[PDB]
Structure 1
Amino acid sequence: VSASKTAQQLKYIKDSIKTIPDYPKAGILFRDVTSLLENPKAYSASIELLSEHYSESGVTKVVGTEARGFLFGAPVALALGVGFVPVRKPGKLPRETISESYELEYGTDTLEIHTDSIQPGDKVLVVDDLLATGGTIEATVKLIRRLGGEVVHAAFIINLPELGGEARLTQQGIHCYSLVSFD
């Protein structure tokens, strides 16, 4: 596709995301991916661009974190013809799990994954809506690699590179692909 037509599609996706001022607090801008979800053309385009980007990568599994990550991961898995494996806050997955901690602003939290859902060999794509500090993604990577899965790719709708996520993931050997970014 011509750079003209690719730019028009990427712009249509970016213009579909709303910017909310002073949310969650004063002096913070919040990029709301829900306006993208309600526009079938923008939502379907975002899934196409993500899935196509990895169509030759030999991905065997897609992992997305709860909750907004499920919105992009699971359609990407469907588009690639591969299973989808959720990573969840603790006590939600019923079968045997492993766990990893991560930092929040005011405390720590954990993510879990089903131990039976990743096995040695698997080539795992991580998908999430937004890359900010990268802490949940760094935890997820650890989870996947502990179960013997290989992960070198993470994909997002939005990157906020100033929050350091992309730079942190790079340190773990993760290449990040984001449809759009903001300052």
Structure 2
Amino acid sequence: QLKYIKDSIKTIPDYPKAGILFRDVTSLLENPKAYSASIELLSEHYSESGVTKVVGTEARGFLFGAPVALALGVGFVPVRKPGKLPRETISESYELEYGTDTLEIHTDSIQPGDKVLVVDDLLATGGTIEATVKLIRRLGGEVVHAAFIINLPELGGEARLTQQGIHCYSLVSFDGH
């Protein structure tokens, strides 16, 4: 199963620059068996967790977070780049390689007592997830779990989230930057 999921992910060499082996999750998306298995494994992993909300960042986070939310029977809450959410938001900044950006969340969608799972497609540096954790906690939400399809351990994302008290669960792992 885990092997069938991993085999369904394609690698594109020298993209987006020479030396990087791009791990392309869209090939998993188009394989119904691998996609539904991925959602099955993520959701069952947290079935006993008392999770009350799932949060995912746009856009690829939506592809894994929302189905997990549906499978758990809990609400899904999007985290978006600025100017896309219509109600009251709070905001957190994070670093890109070449500058800064921000993420927003609806202030009403998280409240004290919420047990929140964050789901994303791939864990790289972990900067967006670290900003997302801060957003949730500022609103009185509890978050100690982040789930991914792919972990790239060499980029230090997991170590960094560990520093914030986050337990990361990933289905597969790959070498490289």
Pairwise same-fold verdict (TM > 0.5): yes
Distance 1:161 1:138 in 2: 16
Deviation at residue 89 of structure 1 after TM alignment: 0.3
CA distance in 1, matches of 2:158, 2:21: 19
Q: Provide TM-score, normalisation by structure 2.
A: 0.99
The CA RMSD over aligned residues, in Å, is 0.3
* Inter-partner Cα distance in structure 1 for 2:143 and 2:158: 15
Distance in structure 2 (CA, Å) of the matches to 1:23 and 1:120: 43
TM-score, normalised to structure 1, is 0.95
Q: Structure 1: 5+ residue runs without aligned partners?
A: 1-8
Deviation at 1:63, TM superposition (A): 0.1
Q: Percent identity?
A: 100
Give the 3-state SS of the residue equivalent to 2:118 in structure 1: strand
Q: What is the rounded CA distance, in whole Å, between the counterparts of 2:29 and 2:157 in structure 1?
A: 23
Partner Cα separation in structure 1 for residue 59 and residue 18 of structure 2: 25
SS of 2:51's equivalent in the other structure is coil
For 1:146 and 1:115, locate their aligned partners in 2 and report how far apart those are by CA, in whole Å. 9
Q: CA deviation at 1:166?
A: 0.3
Q: Residues of 2 paired with 1:173 and 1:12: CA distance?
A: 31
In the alignment, the residues of structure 2 paired with residue 68 and residue 22 of structure 1 have an alpha-carbon distance, to the nearest angstrom, of 22
Aligned residue pairs, count: 175
Structure 2, unpaired ranges of 5+? none
The answer to whether 1:145 aligns with 2:137 is yes
Tell me how far apart the structure 2 counterparts of residues 64 and 79 of structure 1 sit (CA, whole Å): 15
Deviation at 1:26, TM superposition (A): 1.0
Aligned structure 1 segments of 4 or more residues deviating by more than 2 angstroms: none
1:90-112 per-position Cα deviation (integer Å, ceiling 9, x unaligned): 00000000000000000000000
Per-residue Cα deviation, 1:62-84 (whole angstroms, up to 9, x for no partner): 00000000000000000000000
Q: Deviations over 1:13-62 (max 9, x none)?
A: 00000011011111111100000000000000000000000000000000
In 1, the alpha carbon distance for the partners of 2:150 and 2:46 equals 17
Q: Distance in 1 between matches of 2:70 and 2:22?
A: 29
The secondary structure found in structure 1 opposite 2:170 is strand
